[PDB]
Amino acid sequence: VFPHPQDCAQHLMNGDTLSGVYPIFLNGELSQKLQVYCDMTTDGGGWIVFQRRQNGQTDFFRKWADYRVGFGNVEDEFWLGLDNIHRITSQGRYELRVDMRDGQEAAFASYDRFSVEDSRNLYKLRIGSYNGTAGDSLSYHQGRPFSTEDRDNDVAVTNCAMSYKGAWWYKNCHRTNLNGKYGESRHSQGINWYHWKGHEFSIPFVEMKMRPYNH
Ligand SMILES: [Ca+2]
Numbered sequence: 001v002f003p004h005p006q007d008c009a010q011h012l013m014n015g016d017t018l019s020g021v022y023p024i025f026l027n028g029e030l031s032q033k034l035q036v037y038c039d040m041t042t043d044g045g046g047w048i049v050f051q052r053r054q055n056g057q058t059d060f061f062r063k064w065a066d067y068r069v070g071f072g073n074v075e076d077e078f079w080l081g082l083d084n085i086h087r088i089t090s091q092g093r094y095e096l097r098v099d100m101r102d103g104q105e106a107a108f109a110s111y112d113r114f115s116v117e118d119s120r121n122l123y124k125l126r127i128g129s130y131n132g133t134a135g136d137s138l139s140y141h142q143g144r145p146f147s148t149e150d151r152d153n154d155v156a157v158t159n160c161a162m163s164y165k166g167a168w169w170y171k172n173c174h175r176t177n178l179n180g181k182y183g184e185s186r187h188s189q190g191i192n193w194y195h196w197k198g199h200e201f202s203i204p205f206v207e208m209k210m211r212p213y214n215h
Contacts, residue, residue, distance in 0.1 A: 004028045006091055008038035009046030009215045016040070021074060024048070026087050034084060037074040039209055042099060047209035048088060050080035053191055054205045056182030060167065064151040067167050068119070079179065082116060082123045082146060089115035093213040096127060098178070100134055100193055101205040107134035107196050114210055122146055122153050125169040135195020137175040144169040165189045178206050 002010040004025035011022050019040045026032035039047040053060075058077035070081025088094070096114035100107050113128025122145030130136040145153040147160060148167045154160040160170035165181035166189075168174060175194040183202050184190035190202025197203060 002028070004030055007046070007088065007210075007212060008036065008040065008048050009212050011038055012040055012046040017045070019045075024088075027091055035074060036080065037078075039207070042097065042209070044215070046215050047097065047211045048080075049074070049207050049209045050085055050088075051178060051208035052077050052206070053178065053182060053203075060179045061149065061165055061181070062167065064148045067146065067148055083119065086116045086118055086123060089210065094210040095213050095215075096138075097209050097211070098134065098138070098176075098193070099207045099209070100196060100203050102197065102201075102203060107193075108132045109134040109136060109138060109193070111138065112213060116146070123169075134193055137193050137195045140175040141169040141171060144171050163188075178203075178208060 001013050005011045006026060006028050007024055017040050019038060021035060022038045023033050024036050037049040039049050054077055058072050068082050070079055070084060072078025094114045096111045098109045109132040111127040111130055115126045117124040124145050125141055127138055147153040147170045149161040152159045154170035156172040160173035161167050164173055164177055166177045167179045168177055177192045180191050181189050185200050185202055188199045191206060192199050193203060
């Protein structure tokens with residue numbers, strides 16, 4: 001159906017049902033290949049996973065350049081890269097899902113719009129309306145630029161990314177911190193999703209993922 005799938009939903013539509021690594025072609029262009037991890041099972045499948053935490057073996061306390069280009073293994077812990085996320089979210093309207101787990105407990109948050117702006121606009125976050133079980137901890141970050149420890153774009157007098165061991169669309173400073181320090185229970189420094197587990201619990205497994213709206 002789609003000779004050059006531009007996301008995981010188009011792969012799913014072609015008949016590919018197994019989660020794993022797929023090439024997607026941005027704007028359907030053969031020359032714009034990007035390797036991604038497709039979640040083909042959650043809520044019907046078709047998701048591009050663009051962030052994962054699961055074991056703490058990958059350092060996330062990186063700099064702007066690293067968050068721009070991406071790092072990590074898409075089969076393990078990684079960040080797809082802010083330029084890539086901007087390009088994907090510019091090719092249509094995407095929804096965001098955040099899946100989180102703590103042992104046998106699980107929760108999710110979904111937003112019916114998701115985009116980041118370009119480099120010049122500091123990758124500002126845009127999210128739609130919320131539904132789910134984890135609580136809405138991301139709307140606090142609506143409209144905010146991205147910040148890293150070496151590039152403070154937040155509206156705190158402090159450096160949020162340095163103080164809270166992360167990289168995020170910080171304001172003053174956060175309700176979620178999913179690029180924070182793995183396993184870190186000190187208040188607001190770990191992998192927090194406030195409305196699910198507060199600021200003194202670091203979530204051991206999180207995935208951030210996106211699929212075309214109303215798929
Ligand atoms: Ca600041």
